[PDB]
Amino acid sequence: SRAEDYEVLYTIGTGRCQKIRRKSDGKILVWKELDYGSMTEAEKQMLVSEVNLLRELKHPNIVRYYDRIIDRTNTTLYIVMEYCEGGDLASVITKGTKERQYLDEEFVLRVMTQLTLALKECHRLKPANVFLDGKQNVKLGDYYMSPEQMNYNEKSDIWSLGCLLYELCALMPPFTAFSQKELAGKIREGKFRRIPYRYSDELNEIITRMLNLKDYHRPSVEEILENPLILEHHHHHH
């Protein structure tokens, strides 16, 4: 439970990750260095509540949180968590664009199913906040603004997931604009292209239903799962 117990392999993204290996067993994890040196007792309570909340969630489709470490000599809190060895989804989109190949509908279904399960757990979000493990399994972790969020309910997450899945299919968000007001206009207009014709009408139908303007028209977390399109192997397999 100390920064001296871990070795640093390299930095992933500057808080700043590092990817760490624990000398005891040799386990690969990551930590994020958040330096509170410039924070008063005000930030302490909120940050500790955030830590309490994050270290409590135990779900396969969410990046697991493990330990907390303090090195007062550095005033940098290390937050430890699992290392999704497959990277984030934004990198998958980047690789798809750079090789002129579309992602397999089965993979889009995987992401849809596992992220819907993760959202259901959170009730009981960009391609960069979504990682993959070695089994190509989807983990959630810390353009997509919803109609209501810009005139905040559970269906707003449905909308965000619909935008994510659309971007996975089409390799670009459903609403492309240069200015923010132009984006809000394209959204309130509530119109977008169909996902590539390589994808079934059913995938497009579920994704479109997520992107309805009226929140009460988007599918609940369960209506998404009740869909004949979602099979077993789209689920997280250890």
Ligand X SMILES: */C=C/c1nc(Nc2ccc(CC(N)=O)cc2)nc2[nH]cnc12
Binding residues vs ligand X (CB under 6 A): 12-13, 17, 30, 63, 81-84, 87-88, 91, 131, 141
At its nearest, how many Å lie between ligand X and the CB of residue 116? 20
CA distance 211 to 218: 7
At its nearest, how many Å lie between ligand X and the CB of residue 13? 5
Residue among 63 and 93 whose Cβ is closer to ligand X: 63
Residue among 13 and 185 whose Cβ is closer to ligand X: 13
Q: Are 83 and 19 in contact (CB under 8 A)?
A: yes
122 is in an annotated binding site: no
Residue among 68 and 209 whose Cβ is closer to ligand X: 68
At its nearest, how many Å lie between ligand X and the CB of residue 69? 15
C-alpha count within 13 angstroms, C-beta hemisphere, residue 220: 4
Which among 101, 95, 133 is positioned nearest to 237, based on CA atoms? 133
13 is in an annotated binding site: yes
Q: Are 183 and 78 in contact (CB under 8 A)?
A: no
Closest residue to ligand X: CB criterion: 17
Residue among 92 and 221 whose Cβ is closer to ligand X: 92
What are residue 11's DSSP bridge partners? Answer: 18
Q: Are 36 and 90 in contact (CB under 8 A)?
A: no
Residue among 6 and 83 whose Cβ is closer to ligand X: 83
96 is in an annotated binding site: no
12 is in an annotated binding site: yes
At its nearest, how many Å lie between ligand X and the CB of residue 40? 27
**Structure tokens that stand for 72 in this block:** 């007062």
Q: 12 to each of 83, 90, 106, how far by Cα in Å?
A: 11, 14, 28
32 is in an annotated binding site: yes
70 is in an annotated binding site: no
Q: Are 64 and 58 in contact (CB under 8 A)?
A: yes
CA distance 68 to 54: 11
At its nearest, how many Å lie between ligand X and the CB of residue 60? 14
Residues that constitute the known binding site for ATP: 12-17, 32
Residues that constitute the known binding site: 12-17, 32
